[PDB]
Design a protein around this ligand. Structure first.
Ligand code: B5M
Ligand code: MG
Length: 534
């Protein structure tokens, strides 16, 4: 028996083996903060961009008060709560407060707009939605009004800032109350994947598998109480939350430092000020930092570890990380679905430069298969399938997609093309899935195509990735015009999609109008050629 329906538990024989192996320890995710605050109450747990800071005891106490306040509003055992917050201390407190109340956080990104928010709130039957007031010039309260109109289950909107007619997140506060613990085998939180279908898919992560994710990642990355970790990616990104991210830093007793943006201005200042020793970035930001040290005077010497993942970091900039940034590079090929590959901190420099790591767990199972589904010869390129103690057996409330995306014996089909080397290290070689990787941001082609086809001048749309030297891929929207109408140009299409509530990283970089698409279904390899003029 589980608190939520709509997800796919592990078969009992696998659960047994993961508990016996010590992976699944039987503790709720919030216990990592409870235990650290009990052992190290006066250590500095969290520092925000302004320079305010909190001890483990202070953070633990505040999570308890906000948990009790959430219960006063009726937010509790099993309720799904959409969270959309910036990199501020409000997120960290609310994350643990939701857990201790028994609510299930549904983590979205600040950049998400009405289309994504309404879909995940709908799919999760969410009862509450947590927003900033205004962030990066966008008023999220209007989005919450639009979300409430489309999703009647949303009863509460909690605002970090001026709450307008809603509830101020700072007012969610009460005397702590005895709160029951959740079952560690139950879903702890729901992550968002870019996906490959017409809707983003929700990833259920349980207490046991996410604690293992965090704990084993912290071990491999050498996180301990001496770690000062700079959250440069959004707190809701799996990379920065749990790999090992801020949760790993808190588990082991380090200091989490929140960066408001990844710019050198903000990040280089916080690295020097707080003596940051570790952080995680996407390759476009790695390239930006590698340039910026040549004109920035910040002392970055405290940096010991730079994790880079989300798209493939090239071998040439990878080799520059030690000379330029004075730290160890760790390549990370991970996914919110589960499987994490890490280079080890003492791997020979060859493997740090040339590979995307080897799997985190001894019981991460790897298969590399050809177009027919048969295992490739060792060292051949094929699609990566994987199964393990923290990789899902199915997406949340997506039966039909689950039937397509998981093999009969439970292997998740990643859509990534890889080689496995004799050492077990992976080299990422490409993608099989119909999803564009734009600087680490994942763009489901089918979701974007359906948005574009809603435009009155558009009859058909095929979204095609274009190689880019610093962004990895850009987005080209190939358009068949509506019968007797003109298709829009780039700027009109972007305005249409923004008004429709499409996150800005999904806006096409380029529009190409044509009479028909090549057919094999649409042949996107041939579309690439026609786009390139060949
Ligand atoms: C980066 C990361 C670290 C830890 C936890 C995460 O969760 C994530 C993350 O990126 O989460 P995503 O959900 O975006 O997963 C989509 C994934 O990104 C692609 N990818 C990811 N790292 C890659 C790399 N180092 N080199 C080439 N490609 C990579 C694949 O396509 C794959 O499937
Ligand atoms: Mg149309």
């Amino acid at each position: 028996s589980h608190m939520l329906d709509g997800w796919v538990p592990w078969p009992e024989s696998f659960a047994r083996r993961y508990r016996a192996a010590g992976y699944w320890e039987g503790r709720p995710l919030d216990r990592l903060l409870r235990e650290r605050a009990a052992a190290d109450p006066d250590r500095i747990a969290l520092v925000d961009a302004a320079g305010d800071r909190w001890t483990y005891a202070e953070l633990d106490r505040h999570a308890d008060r906000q948990a009790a306040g959430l219960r006063r509003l009726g937010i509790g055992a099993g309720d799904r709560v959409v969270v959309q917050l910036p990199n501020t201390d409000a997120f960290v407190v609310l994350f643990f407060a939701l857990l201790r109340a028994g609510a299930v956080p549904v983590l979205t990104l600040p950049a998400h707009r009405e289309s994504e928010i309404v879909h995940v709130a709908e799919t999760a039957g969410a009862t509450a939605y947590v927003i900033p007031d205004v962030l990066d010039g966008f008023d999220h309260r209007a989005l919450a009004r639009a979300a409430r109109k489309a999703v009647p289950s949303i009863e509460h909107v909690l605002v970090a800032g001026e709450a307008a007619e809603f509830t101020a997140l700072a007012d969610v506060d009460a005397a702590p109350v005895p709160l029951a613990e959740p079952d560690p085998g139950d879903v702890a939180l729901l992550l968002l994947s870019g996906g490959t279908t017409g809707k983003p898919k929700l990833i259920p992560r349980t207490h046991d598998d996410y604690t293992y994710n965090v704990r084993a990642s912290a071990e491999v990355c050498g996180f301990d109480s001496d770690t000062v970790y700079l959250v440069v990616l959004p707190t809701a990104h799996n990379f920065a939350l749990a790999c090992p991210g801020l949760l790993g830093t808190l588990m082991v007793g380090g200091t989490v430092v929140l960066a408001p943006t990844p710019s050198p201005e903000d990040a280089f200042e916080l690295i020097e000020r707080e003596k940051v020793t570790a952080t995680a970035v996407v390759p476009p930001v790695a390239l930006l930092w590698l340039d910026a040290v040549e004109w920035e005077d910040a002392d970055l010497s405290s940096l010991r570890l730079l994790q880079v993942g989300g798209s493939k970091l090239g071998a040439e900039p990878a080799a520059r990380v030690r000379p330029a940034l004075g730290c160890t590079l760790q390549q990370v090929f991970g996914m919110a679905e589960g499987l994490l590959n890490y280079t080890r901190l003492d791997d020979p420099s060859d493997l740090v430069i040339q590979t995307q790591g080897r799997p985190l767990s001894p019981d991460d199972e790897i298969r590399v298969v050809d177009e027919d589904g048969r295992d490739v010869a060792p060292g051949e390129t094929g699609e990566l399938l994987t199964r393990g103690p923290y990789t899902l057996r199915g997406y949340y409330r997506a039966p039909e997609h689950n039937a397509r995306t998981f093999s009969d014996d439970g292997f998740y089909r990643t859509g990534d093309l890889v080689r496995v080397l004799p050492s077990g290290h992976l080299v990422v070689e490409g993608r099989a899935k119909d999803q564009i990787n734009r600087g680490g941001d994942k763009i489901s082609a089918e979701e974007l195509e359906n948005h574009i086809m809603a435009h009155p001048g558009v009859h058909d749309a095929a979204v095609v990735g274009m190689p880019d030297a610093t962004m990895g891929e850009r987005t080209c929207a190939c358009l068949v015009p509506r019968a007797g109408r003109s298709a829009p140009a780039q700027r009109e299409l972007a305005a249409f999609l923004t008004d429709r509530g499409v996150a800005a990283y999904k806006l096409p970089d380029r529009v190409e109008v044509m009479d028909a698409f090549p057919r094999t279904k649409t042949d996107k390899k041939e579309l690439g050629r026609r786009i390139a003029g060949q």
